[PDB]
Design a protein around this ligand. Sequence first.
Ligand code: HEM
Length: 152
Amino acid sequence: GLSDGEWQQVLNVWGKVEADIAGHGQEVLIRLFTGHPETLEKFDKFKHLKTEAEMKASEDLKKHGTVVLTALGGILKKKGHHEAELKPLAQSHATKHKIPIKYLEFISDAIIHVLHSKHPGDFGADAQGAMTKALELFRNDIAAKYKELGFQ
Ligand code: HEM
């Protein structure tokens, strides 16, 4: 898992996201959708977005971005003791939304990219290392739930 120092780094970085949750959420989803078009097809409510301009102008996409990052933030603040928060998320994404773990890898990478894009020179090597470990823990624990369900 993460050391106490690493968790402190993760939550310090997260402070940046909380200053503009909607903005960060929107950019993460847009990065995901534009870099991996197949992911957009998983959202019946966003598949109508044919261009990045339409994505950028979608208030509902920003709304979902807020929902996504608020959920992730709650999980991160548990510093690994997130079973109750993570299990339901893993089950809904596997059984209901049918999200392959690969897409969770994609969105994890998108978060790292967006942090650098919005905070160039202010997302240090140590910070990236800590956030990466937190996102991997998140992804790996979801993966365990996916295996339980036999979901691919
Ligand atoms: C940072 C990782 C993610 C988090 C924290 C997250 C969180 C959430 C939350 C809180 C909801 C609403 C409640 C629910 O249905 O469980 C949701 C819905 C959904 N998520 Fe995710 N999600 C993540 C990644 C993804 C990825 C990678 C995809 C597919 C590319 C995805 C697709 C969906 C869909 C299709 C819905 C239903 C949307 C609707 O209301 O129509 N999610 N997600």
